[PDB]
Amino acid sequence: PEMVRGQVFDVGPRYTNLSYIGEGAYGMVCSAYDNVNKVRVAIKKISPFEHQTYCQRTLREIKILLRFRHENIIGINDIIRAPTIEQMKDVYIVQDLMETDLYKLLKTQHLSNDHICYFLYQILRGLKYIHSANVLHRDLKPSNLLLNTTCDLKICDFGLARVADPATRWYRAPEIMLNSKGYTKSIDIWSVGCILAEMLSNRPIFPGKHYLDQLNHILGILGSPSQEDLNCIINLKARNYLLSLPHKNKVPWNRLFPNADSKALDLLDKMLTFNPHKRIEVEQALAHPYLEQYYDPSDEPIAEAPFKFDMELDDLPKEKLKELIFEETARFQPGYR
Numbered sequence: 633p634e635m636v637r638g639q640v641f642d643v644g645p646r647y648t649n650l651s652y653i654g655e656g657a658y659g660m661v662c663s664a665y666d667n668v669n670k671v672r673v674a675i676k677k678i679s680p681f682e683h684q685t686y687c688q689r690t691l692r693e694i695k696i697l698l699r700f701r702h703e704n705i706i707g708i709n710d711i712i713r714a715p716t717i718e719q720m721k722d723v724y725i726v727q728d729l730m731e732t733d734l735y736k737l738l739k740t741q742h743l744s745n746d747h748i749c750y751f752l753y754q755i756l757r758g759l760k761y762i763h764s765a766n767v768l769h770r771d772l773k774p775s776n777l778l779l780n781t782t783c784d785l786k787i788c789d790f791g792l793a794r795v796a797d798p799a800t801r802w803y804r805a806p807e808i809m810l811n812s813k814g815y816t817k818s819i820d821i822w823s824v825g826c827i828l829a830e831m832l833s834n835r836p837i838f839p840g841k842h843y844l845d846q847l848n849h850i851l852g853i854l855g856s857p858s859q860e861d862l863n864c865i866i867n868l869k870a871r872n873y874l875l876s877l878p879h880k881n882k883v884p885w886n887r888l889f890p891n892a893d894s895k896a897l898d899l900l901d902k903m904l905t906f907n908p909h910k911r912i913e914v915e916q917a918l919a920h921p922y923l924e925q926y927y928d929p930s931d932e933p934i935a936e937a938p939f940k941f942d943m944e945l946d947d948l949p950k951e952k953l954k955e956l957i958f959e960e961t962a963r964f965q966p967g968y969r
């Protein structure tokens with residue numbers, strides 16, 4: 633078994649020439665060569681079975697990404713795991729190989745306005761498909777926006793994704809921290825707005841240290857919530873918390889982004905709206921004048937049908953989640969069904 637930084641990558645003989653390329657809180661990702669198809673791939677090793685929440689992430693990512701097929705969404709090419717459930721300790725997810733992610737690119741490079749507009753267009757194009765399947769990604773951030781040499785962008789990391797039905801916190805919408813319930817497609821648009829702001833200045837717009845600090849960052853730029861804003865917070869204890877904060881004036885977007893295109897700041901304003909019911913929707917954002925050079929509805933496909941898991945996962949024990957992961961990956965085993 634090939635080894636990478638002291639870690640077993642048990643993916644041969646088909647996949648060889650492994651090279652470390654990144655890592656998140658759950659998976660180690662390596663580049664590799666697929667000797668069967670004669671193509672470069674990425675391989676994510678995850679080891680989730682001792683944790684119920686990690687098992688949920690693994691099953692959600694596998695189920696959603698095998699059902700999605702879109703240019704701006706990473707696909708799963710193959711899944712490697714042991715032939716028996718008792719031997720199964722790691723899962724390897726094989727994906728198309730991307731060259732970097734937006735987090736790493738922003739560390740090294742200031743983006744031009746054409747770059748920002750193009751990246752923002754691809755994010756929203758992929759998000760249009762996700763939302764059209766009635767799915768929430770729920771964890772959009774620069775590190776899960778993959779990029780290749782030709783500037784193509786793919787969204788990845790669907791372990792928190794959920795059917796819509798009303799690590800880092802810097803991109804979490806305010807209602808996640810205040811309501812803990814009733815999440816809509818609106819939460820992804822907030823994340824995209826945070827990403828846009830970071831592309832405009834190469835710094836995160838709301839880099840809070842904890843939920844309390846996070847809310848103070850957001851309010852220190854948006855200003856204290858309006859009465860209509862307050863009425864959309866359902867948890868009254870959370871409303872009382874907001875009402876206990878000192879008044880804060882809104883900071884004009886062109887104070888934060890003085891050289892930014894005014895059309896980008898108009899869209900940004902509509903994405904980073906406190907009230908999720910007033911926040912711009914993905915199709916309206918695609919149609920905003922900022923993206924006029926790219927917007928092409930006939931070339932922005934949607935899902936044939938809304939997605940559904942066919943079972944609630946939140947309450948299942950991890951040993952049951954393990955059996956579901958085994959079942960869901962059987963289609964990549966020789967001799968399946």
Ligand SMILES: Nc1ncnc2c1ncn2[C@@H]1O[C@H](COP(=O)(O)OP(=O)(O)NP(=O)(O)O)[C@@H](O)[C@H]1O
Nearest residue numbers: 654655656657658659661674727729730733775789
């Ligand atoms: N298909 C891929 N091609 C190239 N690099 C990739 C690919 N998938 C992931 N990466 C890199 O590996 C990192 C970790 O992947 P990710 O899927 O976010 O792992 P995770 O641990 O399951 N979740 P998280 O903690 O949210 O990052 C990414 O941020 C990328 O830099």
Ligand SMILES: *[C@@H]1[C@H](C(=O)OC(C)(C)C)C(=O)CC[C@]1(C)C(=O)OCC#C
Nearest residue numbers: 731732746747750779780781782783784
């Ligand atoms: C795209 C690249 C790019 O995708 O970065 C990596 C590191 C993946 C090669 C850039 O960020 C700069 C050049 C380019 C082509 C770009 O942004 O131009 C398109 C336009 C307008």
